[PDB]
Amino acid sequence: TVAVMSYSGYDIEDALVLNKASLDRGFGRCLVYKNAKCTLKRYTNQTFDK
Amino acid sequence: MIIPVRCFTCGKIVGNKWEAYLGLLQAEYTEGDALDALGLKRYCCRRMLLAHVDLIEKLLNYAPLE
Amino acid sequence: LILTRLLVPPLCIRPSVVNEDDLTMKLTEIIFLNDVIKKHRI
Amino acid sequence: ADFDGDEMNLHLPQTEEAKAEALVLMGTKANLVTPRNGEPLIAAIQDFLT
Amino acid sequence: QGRFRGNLSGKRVDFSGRTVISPDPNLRIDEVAVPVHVAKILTFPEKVNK
Amino acid sequence: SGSMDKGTLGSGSKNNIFYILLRDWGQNEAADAMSRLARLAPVYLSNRGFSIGIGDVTPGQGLLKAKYELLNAGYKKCDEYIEALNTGKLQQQPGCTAE
Amino acid sequence: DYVTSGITGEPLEAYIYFGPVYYQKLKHMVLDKMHARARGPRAVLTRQP
Amino acid sequence: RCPDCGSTELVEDSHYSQSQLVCSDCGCVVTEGVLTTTFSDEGNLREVTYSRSTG
Amino acid sequence: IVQDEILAHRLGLIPIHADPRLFEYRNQGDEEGTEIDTLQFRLQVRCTRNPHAAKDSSDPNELYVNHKVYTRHMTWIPLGNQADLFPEGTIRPVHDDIL
Amino acid sequence: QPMIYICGECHTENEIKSRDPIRCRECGYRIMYKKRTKRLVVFDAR
Ligand SMILES: [Mg+2]
Ligand SMILES: [Zn+2]
Ligand SMILES: [Zn+2]
Ligand SMILES: [Zn+2]
């Protein structure tokens, strides 16, 4: 729900104002997923990681 | 994924409207008549149900089950 | 102005893994060719 | 700068001499006019003109 | 990437930070707002005296 | 008298009021006045209200008639020039050949 | 639309253009870009950060 | 062993970006700073089998 | 399928039917709380296949039982002497339909 | 006592506790997932 107006002067050069309560009600919520991995391998000599 | 509980803009409870909305649509209503029947007046609230995509139904088909 | 010796640069300006830096490869191939020509002329 | 996702760097001088030189020669208040022809650069901007 | 262009004439320094920028018209024209997180990392060595 | 605009507040040129302050009374006065303006203008404007809408860009009525007449006149004139050229009647402007 | 101010409680002096627009959030976030260095590892060939 | 208090409770620890070896009982710093190769040379790595490197 | 953080956020927004004029603000720390400044609910549901399902194997409302978690599965857990002061049925979620 | 990995296809509990190569006990699948933790975790509903 956008309103096109000048307000508070914290929106001068393409910055924009966001309503706090909408953010508290789930507006713009997001999830970030990241992955890590490891390998255990057997060497030529009969020895291995553990 | 799943219907949000409260309308973002004004804080009205819309989380309990999804099943009723689908039922009224199933009765050959139109979206306007269904939304007015449920009592959602402010257009900041009608978009909460008119523009929802129910991904949980499709996601659960890939979920593990016995 | 005509060269007959070369200073091999110190280790610190050519780290352990470039495994080793290419200047080391050039130096080793030069010395290899030197040994080849020496023994072959003899 | 225009606040469309831009980034800026920042340095912290580690000496009293550097501090004094930065403050006296690079101060913002001492650089209100550009040296090309002596015209102001730091003045009001959009939405302060309106 | 040679020595003269890349290393001697311009080089990397420490005690410096980078971040996005945003507006704040409640400051003077000679102040900048620094996050508390970055204030805790950069350090200035003060000599002790009377 | 007058009303303030880019030529008297903006970073264009001299006659800027902050420039006058800087040159006649010092750096501190200009730096103070800039912050005073930056704090005062938003309080007025954000409570007065100022917006742009589609109504501000919809064309008027008489503009449509004027544009229609202008388009017709220009197209007709162009057609007569091309007519003059293709039959050779066109007078060659004394700076270049006909094209 | 006729709009009433929320700080002063008094009507505004111009009708405000109001309505819904589709907004999308890009992948760039400030939390992933804040970075600062005081002292740390240095290269081997040239002892620079 | 910590040269200042002689205790053996040395712990390897890094501050925000600075790696160091700190006596966990008196706060002394015994060794700080590391020198590590970067990507600019990471792209150039070759291989020589040691058997080859040994003749 | 719902993540823990999203699920907790969703549970945060459910209005409760207690009277806030009979409780005090919880002091800083003391996460345990006590009977004078907290309420407790317990949610516990498990989904299982319906033993009496027909062969249609097509309607989710018949294949499974407790496949939808509504807000009516939350049970008030009295704490301290609250069981006497608040008569049965006064402490509950307001709406009872929220999915 | 031995630890349980859930098979990725039939979801039958399997115990390995050895260097035995990964493979399900009932089906042929070769992917396993750890069970959820038993400790409780506290979240803020904000
Ligand atoms: Mg930009
Ligand atoms: Zn609403
Ligand atoms: Zn010590
Ligand atoms: Zn299996």
From Swiss-Prot, chain A:
Mg(2+) binds at residue 14. It is found in: Nucleus; Cytoplasm, Cytosol. Catalytic core component of RNA polymerase III (Pol III), a DNA-dependent RNA polymerase which synthesizes small non-coding RNAs using the four ribonucleoside triphosphates as substrates. Synthesizes 5S rRNA, snRNAs, tRNAs and miRNAs from at least 500 distinct genomic loci. Pol III-mediated transcription cycle proceeds through transcription initiation, transcription elongation and transcription termination stages. During transcription initiation, Pol III is recruited to DNA promoters type I, II or III with the help of general transcription factors and other specific initiation factors. Belongs to the RNA polymerase beta chain family. This is DNA-directed RNA polymerase III subunit RPC2. It comes from Homo sapiens. The chain holds residues 740 to 789 of 1133 of the full protein.
Curated annotation (Swiss-Prot), chain B:
GO terms for biological process: regulation of transcription by RNA polymerase I; transcription by RNA polymerase I; transcription by RNA polymerase II; tRNA transcription by RNA polymerase III. Component of the RNA polymerase I (Pol I), RNA polymerase II (Pol II) and RNA polymerase III (Pol III) complexes consisting of at least 13, 12 and 17 subunits, respectively. Pol I complex consists of a ten-subunit catalytic core composed of POLR1A/RPA1, POLR1B/RPA2, POLR1C/RPAC1, POLR1D/RPAC2, POLR1H/RPA12, POLR2E/RPABC1, POLR2F/RPABC2, POLR2H/RPABC3, POLR2K/RPABC4 and POLR2L/RPABC5; a mobile stalk subunit POLR1F/RPA43 protruding from the core and additional subunits homologous to general transcription factors POLR1E/RPA49 and POLR1G/RPA34. PROSITE patterns: RNA_POL_N_8KD. GO terms for cellular component: cytosol; nucleoplasm; nucleus; RNA polymerase I complex; RNA polymerase II, core complex; RNA polymerase III complex. Belongs to the archaeal Rpo10/eukaryotic RPB10 RNA polymerase subunit family. Signal peptide: none annotated. Zn(2+) binds at residues 7, 10, 44-45. Keywords: DNA-directed RNA polymerase, Metal-binding, Nucleus, Transcription, Zinc. PANTHER family: DNA-DIRECTED RNA POLYMERASES I, II, AND III SUBUNIT RPABC5, DNA-DIRECTED RNA POLYMERASES I, II, AND III SUBUNIT RPABC5 FAMILY MEMBER. GO terms for molecular function: DNA binding; DNA-directed RNA polymerase activity; zinc ion binding. HAMAP family: RNApol_arch_Rpo10. It comes from the Eukaryota. It comes from Homo sapiens (Human). Coiled coil: none annotated.
Curated annotation (Swiss-Prot), chain E:
It comes from the Eukaryota. It is found in: Nucleus; Cytoplasm, Cytosol. DNA template strand binds at residues 5, 12, 18. Disulfide bonds: none annotated. Expressed in the brain, in the cortex and the white matter (at protein level). Belongs to the RNA polymerase beta' chain family. Catalytic core component of RNA polymerase III (Pol III), a DNA-dependent RNA polymerase which synthesizes small non-coding RNAs using the four ribonucleoside triphosphates as substrates. Synthesizes 5S rRNA, snRNAs, tRNAs and miRNAs from at least 500 distinct genomic loci. Pol III-mediated transcription cycle proceeds through transcription initiation, transcription elongation and transcription termination stages. During transcription initiation, Pol III is recruited to DNA promoters type I, II or III with the help of general transcription factors and other specific initiation factors. This is DNA-directed RNA polymerase III subunit RPC1. It comes from Homo sapiens (Human). The lineage of its organism: Eukaryota, Metazoa, Chordata, Craniata, Vertebrata. The gene is POLR3A. The chain holds residues 349 to 398 of 1390 of the full protein.
From Swiss-Prot, chain H:
This is Transcription factor IIIB 50 kDa subunit. Induction: Down-regulated by epigallocatechin gallate (EGCG) treatment. Coiled coil: none annotated. Belongs to the TFIIB family. General activator of RNA polymerase III transcription. Factor exclusively required for RNA polymerase III transcription of genes with promoter elements upstream of the initiation sites. Contributes to the regulation of gene expression; functions as activator in the absence of oxidative stress. Down-regulates expression of target genes in response to oxidative stress. Overexpression protects cells against apoptosis in response to oxidative stress. Component of TFIIIB complexes. The TFIIIB complex has two activities, alpha and beta. The TFIIIB-alpha activity complex is composed of TBP, BDP1, and a complex containing both BRF2 and at least four stably associated proteins; this complex inhibits the transcription by pol III via its phosphorylation by CK2; YY1 facilitates the TFIIIB-alpha complex formation. Interacts with TBP; this interaction promotes recruitment of BRF2 to TATA box-containing promoters. The chain holds residues 6 to 60 of 419 of the full protein. It comes from the Eukaryota. It is found in: Nucleus. Zn(2+) binds at residues 2, 5, 23, 26. A zinc finger (TFIIB-type) spans 1-31. It comes from Homo sapiens.
